[PDB]
Scaffold this active site. Structure first.
Site, PDB file in Angstrom:
ATOM      1  N   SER A  39     -30.579  36.804  56.778  1.00 20.06           N
ATOM      2  CA  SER A  39     -30.610  37.810  56.987  1.00 20.06           C
ATOM      3  C   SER A  39     -30.522  38.370  58.583  1.00 20.06           C
ATOM      4  CB  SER A  39     -32.032  37.645  56.849  1.00 20.06           C
ATOM      5  OG  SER A  39     -32.673  39.160  57.433  1.00 20.06           O
ATOM      6  N   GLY A  40     -30.329  39.451  58.545  1.00 21.59           N
ATOM      7  CA  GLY A  40     -30.024  39.923  59.651  1.00 21.59           C
ATOM      8  C   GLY A  40     -31.306  39.929  60.558  1.00 21.59           C
ATOM      9  N   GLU A  98     -37.794  48.233  55.806  1.00 19.22           N
ATOM     10  CA  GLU A  98     -36.810  47.325  56.429  1.00 19.22           C
ATOM     11  C   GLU A  98     -38.433  46.942  57.882  1.00 19.22           C
ATOM     12  OE1 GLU A  98     -33.752  47.408  57.412  1.00 19.22           O
ATOM     13  OE2 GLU A  98     -33.733  47.696  54.974  1.00 19.22           O
ATOM     14  N   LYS A 135     -23.469  36.618  57.177  1.00 18.41           N
ATOM     15  CA  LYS A 135     -24.036  36.309  56.257  1.00 18.41           C
ATOM     16  C   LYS A 135     -23.443  35.281  54.637  1.00 18.41           C
ATOM     17  CE  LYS A 135     -27.173  39.650  55.758  1.00 18.41           C
ATOM     18  NZ  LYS A 135     -28.371  40.510  54.630  1.00 18.41           N
ATOM     19  N   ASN A 189     -24.040  45.621  55.838  1.00 18.53           N
ATOM     20  CA  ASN A 189     -23.922  44.459  56.181  1.00 18.53           C
ATOM     21  C   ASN A 189     -23.567  42.918  55.786  1.00 18.53           C
ATOM     22  OD1 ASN A 189     -26.754  44.601  55.755  1.00 18.53           O
ATOM     23  ND2 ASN A 189     -27.053  42.820  57.397  1.00 18.53           N
ATOM     24  N   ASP A 203     -34.313  42.587  53.437  1.00 21.36           N
ATOM     25  CA  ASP A 203     -35.061  43.783  53.829  1.00 21.36           C
ATOM     26  C   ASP A 203     -34.510  44.377  53.297  1.00 21.36           C
ATOM     27  OD1 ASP A 203     -34.325  42.994  56.822  1.00 21.36           O
ATOM     28  OD2 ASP A 203     -36.307  43.436  57.171  1.00 21.36           O
ATOM     29  N   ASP A 246     -31.075  39.076  49.981  1.00 23.57           N
ATOM     30  CA  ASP A 246     -30.865  39.593  51.376  1.00 23.57           C
ATOM     31  C   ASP A 246     -32.936  39.894  51.202  1.00 23.57           C
ATOM     32  OD1 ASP A 246     -30.711  41.273  53.694  1.00 23.57           O
ATOM     33  OD2 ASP A 246     -31.045  43.024  52.345  1.00 23.57           O
TER      34      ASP A 246
HETATM   35 MG   LIG Z   1     -30.747  44.756  53.498  1.00 21.64          MG
END
Ligand SMILES: [Mg+2]
Ligand SMILES: [Mg+2]
Lengths: 395, 395
Positions: B270-271, B191, B315, B341, B184, B182
């Site tokens: 990542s989102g 973030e 993900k 997430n 962030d 991931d």
């Molecule tokens: Mg994160």
């Protein structure tokens, strides 16, 4: 905690000793810096490096609590101020000793050569009881001495009838990820070209030349031409016949299967013939094949090969190609072969292993294996027999 | 050699002991079956299992030769008939304990939970003195007990303020070859979406929602929409600005660099936003990026993302895609994340590591790390601090 204390427990192994010591230590202001524990043949060694309050260390209570608890159940303990390496450095090299048998004299000679060059032995363990006795020594070699070490252990190996390999034990160098095998007398029993020749009634002539070529007495390309010419006039059906007669080297399947478990890219590089090898590569689910190709006219062999010829330099070229495609740096590649035409390939590879090899090859290989078991390669790659059997039992 | 004899040497370490013993053994018909030797805090243990002639073993000479040689230089030796396991079985699992500090009480609690479930400790060693104290225990777990073990050590971990991870120690399962991070608050500090939001003067609102989403209190897609809408009207120049403000997590470079040494495929999932991440992925020479994409009209952000949205299930889908392309089975994959997430991705992966994670993630992760050092991941992957420093010194 402002002061360092070292606690060392030894004696006959008993359950609960470990928990007991740290429970005792917890009544004092103890924080841990390093713990090392092993049990060998029911002999416990537990070394604990800690920090505790200066106040606690300068008082008899910590000592009495530890000594009483440990001596009671029947072990010995030592306690001393440290202020001393926290964690040991990694070994620089590892030495594998394989034999059937490994005499005490052999291993004694290994240990002596090691001591002579100022090499410290950090660990010894067994890696196999079958098909061969295998022992590993992890060592720390003085910088620049590891050439001298390899030479000494090579002398020991020939004189004492054991296999001895010295390998770099650093992080990258031991993340090997790609391996190529020679086919004839390496992955496969015997010489395909001799099997083909027997069909022409020329097994004798060709065997002679093959052994000449594999000892490095003949140019590989000319020797290939002289030998394949012997097959002039055979129907191409002979190819399938010989392909179906091929026997894998003892340990071959175990070797490939274990390498697959470890995520190796696997391939073969041969001066032999693609129509014979590709059928097998498919069965063994290999990732890469390089080989020569027989010329066929009207369903009959002409006695020639179709260019270009995989020669001694060609095999190194093939390995380099394979590793480039797979994204594997040369230092993380392994090559296994038995013959002089494998010399360039073994030298290009991160680790070149000579397997039941002619003198010419064994002379320049990083490691040599003298027993008829291809799976002894796995031992050189850091795998133990125990781990192979466990994984195979898990299926 | 028709009879088995076990020779056990212990005492204060001295040079030449090893060579001396096998030289002595060589005057008797000794062939080796297993050798185990370690030195911990100057305490030698050398256990040697051999075969020798029945004639030799039933005579006092072998005994006297060994006892005299060893006792002379000041160590102890035991000699006994065996007839006894030749080579120990592999451990089933390994346990990592990381802390700053690791109290004796913490480690004592780990050892107690281990003993309670009938788990044998085969080895203990330190794997790091920095940036965190790290200890490894290799263990043998009774079949079916390793669920109970993980639960017990999780309780211990929360109560005693150390990180505790239990991992399968089998051949395949520990040949990990692919890892995703991931971005962030995992690979990167903070973030990104909050950094973008601050430019719109909405840092407050967005931070609130982000922390709600990362704790699993909000659907990720709706939360993404609500938060990105906050950016409606920002010029797309903000993207480059924030990209240049990004700080890597402490230990990130060391982590990636070491994973490259080991031949890992490395990627990020990542989102967040691709225009911000791809610039960085290129700098870190990553193999794979999956991210969302900001919608831009006339050089201005619209406040929407361009479908499809990488969500919680997305993900896991990305990881599966990456591993399929790389030819890596899911069992040999690793995923590292901090937020809810990331839950599906961590569960899909061979090894899911929660890094400074919200409770929702740490609750279902295979392992959790609580210290602000991304390189503690490496310890969970079997690397020691010593090995990292050595490789880095070799350059
Ligand atoms: Mg994160
Ligand atoms: Mg050959």
């Amino acid at each position: 905690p402002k002061v360092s204390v070292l606690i060392t427990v030894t004696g006959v192994d008993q359950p609960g000793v470990t928990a007991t010591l740290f429970e005792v230590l917890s009544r004092h202001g103890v924080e841990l810096l390093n713990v090392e524990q092993v049990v060998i043949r029911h002999r416990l060694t537990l070394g604990v490096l800690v920090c505790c309050p200066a106040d606690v260390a300068d008082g008899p209570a910590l000592r009495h609590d530890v000594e009483a608890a440990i001596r009671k159940v029947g072990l010995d303990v030592s306690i001393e101020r440290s202020d001393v390496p926290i964690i040991r450095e990694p070994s620089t090299h590892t030495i594998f000793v394989l034999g059937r048998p490994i005499t005490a004299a052999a291993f004694g000679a290994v240990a002596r050569e090691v001591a002579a060059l100022g090499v410290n032995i950090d660990l010894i363990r067994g890696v196999s009881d079958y098909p061969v006795i295998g022992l590993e020594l992890r060592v720390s070699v003085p910088p620049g001495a590891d050439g001298a070490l390899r030479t000494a252990l090579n002398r020991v190996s020939s004189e004492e009838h054991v296999d001895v390999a010295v390998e770099d034990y650093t992080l990258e160098r031991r993340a090997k990820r790609l391996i190529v095998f020679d086919v004839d007398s390496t992955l496969v029993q015997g010489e395909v070209i001799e099997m083909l020749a027997a069909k022409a009634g020329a097994e004798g002539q060709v065997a002679a030349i093959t052994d000449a070529a594999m000892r490095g007495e003949l140019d590989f390309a000319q020797s290939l031409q002289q030998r394949v010419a012997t097959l002039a006039g055979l129907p191409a059906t002979v190819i399938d016949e010989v392909a179906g007669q091929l026997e894998l080297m003892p340990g071959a399947r175990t070797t490939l299967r274990t390498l697959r478990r470890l995520g190796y890219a696997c391939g073969v590089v041969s001066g032999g013939f693609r129509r014979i090898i590709e059928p097998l590569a498919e069965e063994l689910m290999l990732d890469y094949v390089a080989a020569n190709e027989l010329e066929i006219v009207d369903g009959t062999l002409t006695g020639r090969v179709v260019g270009p010829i995989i020669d001694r330099a060609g095999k190194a070229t093939a390995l380099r190609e394979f590793a480039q495609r797979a994204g594997v740096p040369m230092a993380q590649t392994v090559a296994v072969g038995n013959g002089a035409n494998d010399i360039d390939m073994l030298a290009a590879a991160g680790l070149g292993i000579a397997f039941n090899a002619k003198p010419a090859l064994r002379e320049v290989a990083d490691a040599s294996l003298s027993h008829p078991y291809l799976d002894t390669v796995l031992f050189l790659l850091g795998v133990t027999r125990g781990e192979i059997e466990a994984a195979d039992a898990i299926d």
